[PDB]
Amino acid sequence: VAIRSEGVSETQQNLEGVENAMEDTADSAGDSAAELETFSKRFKGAMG
Amino acid sequence: VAIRSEGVSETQQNLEGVENAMEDTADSAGDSAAELETFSKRFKGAMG
């Protein structure tokens, strides 16, 4: 009999899923920084 | 119907965890975008 263990032991995974999806949102939000300095440090080429 | 009926279930509860143990690679495989556009920050800045 394993009627209880099957229902709970998935949620321990779902917890890590929430956290790893949060990390994904943070790492993906990091894309908004990826070429940021990369444009601005070039841009004095415009002024020159 | 109800014989050895819940014993296989835990394979699902385990395998869910393997997806989460890939989400914590998907996040960071995403972060590799920030790696390359920061590598380009030097060369783009050097054009500046």
Automatic annotation (TrEMBL), chains A, B:
This is Phate tail tape measure protein. It comes from Haloferax tailed virus 1 (HFTV1).
